[PDB]
Amino acid sequence: NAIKYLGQDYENLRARCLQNGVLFQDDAFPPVSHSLGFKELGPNSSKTYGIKWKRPTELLSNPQFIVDGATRTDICQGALGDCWLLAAIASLTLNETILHRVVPYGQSFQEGYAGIFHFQLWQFGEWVDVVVDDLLPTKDGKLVFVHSAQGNEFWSALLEKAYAKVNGSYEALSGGCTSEAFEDFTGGVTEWYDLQKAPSDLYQIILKALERGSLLGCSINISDIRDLEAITFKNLVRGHAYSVTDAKQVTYQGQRVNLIRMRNPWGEVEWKGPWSDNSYEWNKVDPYEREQLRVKMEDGEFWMSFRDFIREFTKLEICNLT
Ligand SMILES: *[C@](=O)([C]([C]C1=[C][C]=[C][C]=[C]1)[N]C(=O)[C]([C][C]([C])[C])[N]C(=O)O[C][C]O[C][C]O[C])C(=O)[N][C]1[C][C]1
Ligand SMILES: [Ca+2]
């Protein structure tokens, strides 16, 4: 059983709050500016000034911890530089077992609610249970940071808060390494691949990792700084963590083509090249494959051929489990 971060005891705190007729407020990560940050989110910063801390039970009549499962569409980045963390959470959702280690069952805004939630992370070389109160940064009634495509769903917001907690503040999550979040969700072994020097069996390596529920992410290095724009001509985001979410082979004009699926943690802004949602390539695969694989939605998720993937992206990270 996970050891308690800082000795904070989720069930004890919950039961005592319920008995005392109050909602939990977390002394270890309180609803004040120092939990937001120190510079860009510091006490005197423009961003801090516009934020008010509110519980989901203050925002909505019917807040829900999980709605239609804890899935990758639940991860929509807000106004924070934590794409790396969010790419990792989105990948985490594809492995049911590890997902629900990190996100324990039995948490609700109804029976037994007392304004406290908990999550398990691999931290300090231990599996640790981290509590948070459910006060969340908001502006004009909406979450400022991560939110779900399902507007009344809060598990991912609360998880991002717990991860901020262990790192000291939300601002502490601005800029990072996808593999660091991968490790913090698994205790696993991380490896990376230079896509410009990809081994000839990389696609098989990817297939196998996805099969076993390993976590995969990818990115495009900015080799100049940003003097060819943050976004590429074909609508990829440079210096930005994507989750790799599938790998499947289609029959394109009678010939197998290896495809790879990825997801922008923004929940929007997608590749517009071959195999993109509106591309013509889909017209030349058999309708069953097209229907299984293609989803015409601005949801941040899209396909690329593996060929185009290894040309466009520069880095692949894989976190392998037990
Ligand atoms: C991601 O794209 C962020 C944007 C970002 C924010 C703050 C600083 C730098 C970049 N991208 C990253 O965090 C990238 C992700 C990798 C390419 C996978 N990390 C990175 O460039 O490493 C920087 C090192 O910083 C670590 C400092 O630790 C002390 C994003 O969140 N984008 C949305 C804001 C638009
Ligand atoms: Ca959901």
Ligand SMILES: [Ca+2]
């Ligand atoms: Ca899409």
